[PDB]
Ligand binder design. Structure first.
Ligand SMILES: NC(=O)c1ccc[n+]([C@@H]2O[C@H](COP(=O)([O-])OP(=O)(O)OC[C@H]3O[C@@H](n4cnc5c(N)ncnc54)[C@H](O)[C@@H]3O)[C@@H](O)[C@H]2O)c1
Ligand SMILES: NC(=O)c1ccc[n+]([C@@H]2O[C@H](COP(=O)([O-])OP(=O)(O)OC[C@H]3O[C@@H](n4cnc5c(N)ncnc54)[C@H](O)[C@@H]3O)[C@@H](O)[C@H]2O)c1
Ligand SMILES: NC(=O)c1ccc[n+]([C@@H]2O[C@H](COP(=O)([O-])OP(=O)(O)OC[C@H]3O[C@@H](n4cnc5c(N)ncnc54)[C@H](O)[C@@H]3O)[C@@H](O)[C@H]2O)c1
Ligand SMILES: NC(=O)c1ccc[n+]([C@@H]2O[C@H](COP(=O)([O-])OP(=O)(O)OC[C@H]3O[C@@H](n4cnc5c(N)ncnc54)[C@H](O)[C@@H]3O)[C@@H](O)[C@H]2O)c1
Ligand SMILES: [Cl-]
Ligand SMILES: [Cl-]
Ligand SMILES: [Cl-]
Ligand SMILES: [Cl-]
Ligand code: NA
Ligand code: NA
Lengths: 260, 260, 260, 260
């Protein structure tokens, strides 16, 4: 249980980040959520965290592709919470194309959000954690932080970068009561992946669920998606005392992806 | 919670394995323990699991350096428990010397226990798990399954072997409800490590606690030992639903060892 | 021998890149060099390649922190050479500081040059190599593309990114006659490292050569620098037929850094 | 060129080891070959090395699954050569079956040859190299020393073990003029792989060359076999001065296998 803890989850209006926020709230943490979406949906999400789980929840809109906005977001989050114990750097985007066709603006956007925002968020959070002598920074990388696939140059580069940055963060704060680790999921059926399933279905001329099976079979030996709830559970484990000496490392929940 | 589950922990009369057995019993699992020691100590350990935690506990003496004894041990364990849900392949030994001086009998003994017993135990357990469509095989490797140190040829080879074997086990049983992962601890202050601290203290002419600090500083950026209780917690996480799609991978609790 | 081949080496006015250009010229390749420095030194370098080794050499000044300048540089290089067979993405910078103090402009500059320029250069080169059905892209990463050190967040992130990007490039061009690999040096005594030796010497109050020994001892088990000439040799190997099926991987010349 | 050098290649009567011996002889090294086969074929191989390449060649029959025979083989090899500069630990076998069906005798045989012989050969060679202050130990691991496939428990365990042992050897002899590295091939069309192609062809009901294409497509993005000649070239590179500070690491020639 994380009763009293103060958590921030970037990109928590959808997908994995939404489940992270839910699992941290369930465990007793106050939570700042963040990301894009319909205002009515986001306010329902925020108010739900409070009314279900009896914690405080805040939504702070910040486009984390901007460095100063990211650093300002962390300051505003810490002010809202009255502290900052757990930072989950989760927000991310995807774009698929071969390198020689890969849009320069998409490279920049993916590096900005998927890598640089992790740096800027970490930089802003660390002094708060260092002063209190406890912290968790939990970076959501990918199996694509450890291995590659075709047509994902920017994303694989960014996620490999996050895995490196995780190690540095850990080493710089070794022994201080602050850990930093990277959760490296395989496929999780969010909108980020549904777009890729749709693309396969159009390429192959097959129904969406046949396409989902093809997407899994290529990469993920279990032939089952990882769930957002499972990843929330992993984050709660990383936040626990059992993980006090788990730092600078990757926690792969990927159905066997990286085993082969 | 693991209520109803049936667990086997090899080398659980000391050190990490003893804490594993305790944490699994606390979670509600019946437990088979195993290993060498004083009969009075082992029976106190066994009876303690039952009287504290209200589970069934059995001690089965088997020297797991022998293949047939290991396979027979798993059969006897499953018979005692009435099943076998969770196998923790933990028993291990250490011997330090440079390669050209490394005793051939010590190479054989370390390979037999630290690697081959993991194969034989896994082979015996798998058909039981496959029939029921659920299982956890949790191999205790090391940071030395991922990187090396001097004067540990056999041990590093064995532990790298365990990490490879873990991946194969996972892949062969992908999707079946059975996962296999390797917990890779850094330094944990058990008798296996106390011998090495003592050796440093004699080499350097320093007290034992100064030697322990030197042993940590060389390898483990946090400058803190990993605890058996933390590793028990990791095993309980691996045994949980959150880890259903965690398979074929390493879970490093090593204070930053492998980050640098 | 690489007789007839057409090579481009970024950041080849100093250090490792200068030796790369020399070794490729020695092997018979025409070479485009690139980077900052004194005009008289750079023209001596260029004319030396021609007069010693009997190849054609061109200097193209381009600040590769700019995407369009990098893509334009590759076009101009290919025009000068009459082709483009081998691209060595080598230019890089360093800055050391803890994350919470790490200048945002230095993060941006290191990501721009050490990572993004590798993407932009690769993107520009690939269509030329794809049309001819042969190519080598040789990325100069680091041991810090595989592991981390303190106070090098941007650099470690970038170099991990390069290692990921290398894998994608390889996979996208698998079987086409084009390979992409990352050379991952340990310490090499260039100006990039001499600054860090100087910083250690000031911190510890020791002479420069004692500081160099300390810098090695921390990271590099051989206690010897890797040389630019050795790395040139590695590049010539990667460019050879023996390495036709070496692709998507790292070639560590690091004196044992990543073994422990 | 390796003129004057004295090399030993285990399992060099077939496949990769035969090409290793050839490439080392071409470079000017005297060579000891080893392995099973028809006496007339082996003597033709031995005499061919001498008559083509003008070096001395010796065949020493030793079953390297036996520790003492392996240590005695190295002594006899060094006596024949008048030294020992380069040891290539190459001999290996394969057997495919799921873990719960995997013959205990095959596990033992694969561990004995593919792992333990590397230890025993290294142990015997090292004192010779240490006395002269120069050496190369080149271990032939596999992509299966880094990742896994189904039905190869023993082999993957052994090859992961070799990769670990390589690191220890390197670290123990860091700075001494002795390096140790592991060449990690992907598929190479030797008899060891032809058996597996034949098995696929029977399973799928397809001709042998269609089966070979299937075997490649599953694992090896280039869709081309690695050749024994390429691997010989890699060994000659590792034996060169350019590789003086390459130690404790893996050299993957695997057509992209480990990139994804
Ligand atoms: N889905 C998968 O299979 C998978 C696998 C591995 C890793 N990941 C990673 O998990 C993380 C979450 O991905 P997801 O699958 O839940 O995707 P998603 O698209 O469902 O959610 C992305 C979240 O990020 C937010 N967001 C996007 N751009 C933003 C910006 N500029 N600033 C602030 N917030 C922003 C979105 O509004 C949303 O809340 C990403 O880092 C992704 O790379 C996903
Ligand atoms: N202590 C550390 O720092 C550390 C770090 C990483 C991994 N490990 C691993 O953790 C595992 C447990 O080690 P530990 O530190 O608790 O050591 P330990 O010596 O305290 O415990 C070893 C256990 O194995 C048992 N055992 C020994 N030989 C046996 C045999 N032939 N058959 C059956 N049981 C046998 C012992 O009786 C004991 O119960 C080992 O695999 C070790 O390699 C330990
Ligand atoms: N020196 C080491 O120990 C070491 C170790 C591992 C990797 N590396 C890598 O090797 C590569 C070369 O480093 P080095 O040690 O030779 O450093 P160096 O400073 O000697 O050389 C850097 C080169 O890059 C050029 N350069 C710098 N900024 C540039 C820009 N914006 N555009 C174009 N060119 C630019 C410089 O003019 C110079 O030619 C770098 O990528 C570095 O990260 C170095
Ligand atoms: N072929 C591949 O695709 C591939 C890929 C990666 C690694 N490897 C490795 O390359 C090495 C050589 O394999 P190969 O494909 O050339 O196989 P191969 O069967 O063609 O050659 C094996 C060699 O080892 C010898 N040998 C076998 N048992 C022996 C024993 N007990 N003592 C002494 N010598 C013995 C054989 O006589 C033969 O000379 C092996 O270690 C193998 O694991 C092969
Ligand atoms: Cl792919
Ligand atoms: Cl060491
Ligand atoms: Cl460090
Ligand atoms: Cl497989
Ligand atoms: Na892989
Ligand atoms: Na390391």
């Amino acid at each position: 249980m994380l009763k009293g803890k103060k958590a921030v989850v970037t990109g928590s209006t959808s997908g994995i980040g939404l489940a992270m926020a839910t699992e941290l709230a369930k465990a007793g943490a106050d939570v700042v959520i963040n990301g894009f979406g319909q205002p009515e949906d986001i306010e329902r999400e925020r108010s739900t965290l409070e009314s279900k789980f009896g914690v405080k929840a805040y939504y702070l809109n910040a486009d984390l592709s901007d460095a100063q906005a990211t650093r300002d977001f962390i300051a505003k989050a810490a002010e809202a919470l009255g502290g900052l114990d757990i930072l989950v750097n989760n927000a991310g985007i995807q774009h698929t194309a071969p390198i020689e066709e890969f849009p320069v603006d998409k490279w920049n956007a993916i590096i900005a959000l998927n890598l640089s925002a992790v740096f800027h968020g970490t930089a802003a959070a660390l002094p708060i954690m260092q002063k209190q002598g406890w912290g968790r920074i939990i970076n959501i990388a990918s199996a694509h932080g450890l291995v590659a696939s075709v047509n994902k140059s920017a994303y694989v580069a960014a996620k490999h970068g996050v895995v490196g940055l995780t190690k540095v963060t850990a080493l710089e704060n070794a022994g201080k009561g602050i850990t930093c680790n990277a959760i490296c999921p395989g496929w999780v059926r969010t909108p980020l992946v549904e777009k890729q399933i749709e693309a396969i279905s159009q390429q192959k001329g097959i129904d969406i669920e046949a396409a989902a099976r093809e997407l899994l079979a290529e990469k993920q030996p279990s032939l089952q998606f990882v769930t957002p709830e499972q990843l929330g559970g992993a984050a709660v484990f990383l936040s626990s005392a059992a993980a006090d000496q788990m730092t600078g490392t990757t926690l792969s929940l990927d159905g066997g992806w990286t085993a082969r």
